Amino acid sequence: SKESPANNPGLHTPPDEATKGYIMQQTMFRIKDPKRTLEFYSRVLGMSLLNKVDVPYMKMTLYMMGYEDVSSAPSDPVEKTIWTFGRPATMELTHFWGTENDPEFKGYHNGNSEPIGFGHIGITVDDMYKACERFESLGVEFVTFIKDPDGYWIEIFDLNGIRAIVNT
Amino acid sequence: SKESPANNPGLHTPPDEATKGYIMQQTMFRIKDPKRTLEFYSRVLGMSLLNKVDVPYMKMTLYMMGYEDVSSAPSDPVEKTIWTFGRPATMELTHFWGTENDPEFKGYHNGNSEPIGFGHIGITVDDMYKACERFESLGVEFVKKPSDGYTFIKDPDGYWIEIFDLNGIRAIVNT
Ligand code: NI
Ligand code: NI
Numbered sequence: 001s002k003e004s005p006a007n008n009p010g011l012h013t014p015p016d017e018a019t020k021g022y023i024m025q026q027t028m029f030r031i032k033d034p035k036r037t038l039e040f041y042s043r044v045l046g047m048s049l050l051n052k053v054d055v056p057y058m059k060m061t062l063y064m065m066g067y068e069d070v071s072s073a074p075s076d077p078v079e080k081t082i083w084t085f086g087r088p089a090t091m092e093l094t095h096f097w098g099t100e101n102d103p104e105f106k107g108y109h110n111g112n113s114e115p116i117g118f119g120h121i122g123i124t125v126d127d128m129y130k131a132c133e134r135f136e137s138l139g140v141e142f143v144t145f146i147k148d149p150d151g152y153w154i155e156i157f158d159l160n161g162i163r164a165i166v167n168t
Numbered sequence: 169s170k171e172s173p174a175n176n177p178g179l180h181t182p183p184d185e186a187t188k189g190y191i192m193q194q195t196m197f198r199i200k201d202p203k204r205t206l207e208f209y210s211r212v213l214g215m216s217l218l219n220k221v222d223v224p225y226m227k228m229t230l231y232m233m234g235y236e237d238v239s240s241a242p243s244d245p246v247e248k249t250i251w252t253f254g255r256p257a258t259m260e261l262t263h264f265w266g267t268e269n270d271p272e273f274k275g276y277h278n279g280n281s282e283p284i285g286f287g288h289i290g291i292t293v294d295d296m297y298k299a300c301e302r303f304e305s306l307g308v309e310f311v312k313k314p315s316d317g318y319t320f321i322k323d324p325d326g327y328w329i330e331i332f333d334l335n336g337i338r339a340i341v342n343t
Pocket of ligand 1: 120155196
């Protein structure tokens with residue numbers, strides 16, 4: 001296959017046994033205002049607030065977001081946090097206190113203009129027509145990419161659209 | 169709880185029906201050199217190569233990587249791509265042809281120096297101290313000391329990758 005080590009210099013297979021059980025747990029973005037951020041990730045994207053971790057000594061709050069049923073999460077706060085950090089595919093949205101009130105705060109950089117680096121996260125939806133119609137109805141900002149309230153890029157795709165691209 | 173909508177202005181919960189089954193599928197980084205990036209994510213982190221997509225009209229290759237048994241994936245290349253895009257928690261590592269040789273390539277920006285923005289990805293390991301001894305053995309660069317229950321290592325482009333175990337998290341939270 002085109003994914004084989006012979007076709008991909010540097011690819012190491014099989015994974016070392018010491019790594020088995022590692023999970024890709026989070027992607028962290030710095031965010032200006034938790035009110036706008038919470039509304040975007042929870043209302044527009046459908047994620048749940050898995051955990052809010054205030055870190056007073058660092059003047060910051062971590063909002064852990066993801067696609068989970070929090071009605072069945074552990075009720076004990078410590079065990080709910082441990083549960084959160086066992087879940088793959090979360091967002092860590094970091095609010096440094098005061099950015100939302102500082103008239104000199106210049107904004108966070110999204111990686112897609114110089115200096116370039118970070119690209120985007122991407123969400124698999126059921127149907128790109130339905131998803132985009134609904135985003136328009138909610139007043140979402142479009143760059144297929146939408147933008148969160150700090151300007152980070154969020155790619156949207158469905159499996160039928162992927163199949164059509166791969167087939168050309 | 170401290171995650172309640174009453175305690176968190178802007179929180180819209182539970183999710184809208186239309187978002188049923190949405191998944192957080194990928195985190196995309198631009199990478200200078202696919203051989204270095206494949207070795208880091210596959211050897212150091214233990215990710216697999218789920219899919220390689222050459223896009224010749226954009227002079228780029230997409231390397232999709234994550235924690236999966238790729239021996240379980242479809243053999244049909246089209247179906248294997250579709251399988252990839254139904255897996256949560258992947259990396260999309262984007263190689264623009266020529267950055268690996270260009271003598272004036274300035275590097276990719278990791279978000280943690282001005283102008284700041286993007287932070288990191290993070291990996292839950294079995295045992296931070298065990299993981300870090302092994303990272304050391306593989307010549308991995310560290311951003312901070314393994315202490316206070318977390319560290320960051322750097323990928324070949326300089327992106328930060330947090331490392332923690334659940335005992336580390338529990339210790340942090342209990343303070
Ligand atoms: Ni993408
Ligand atoms: Ni983190």
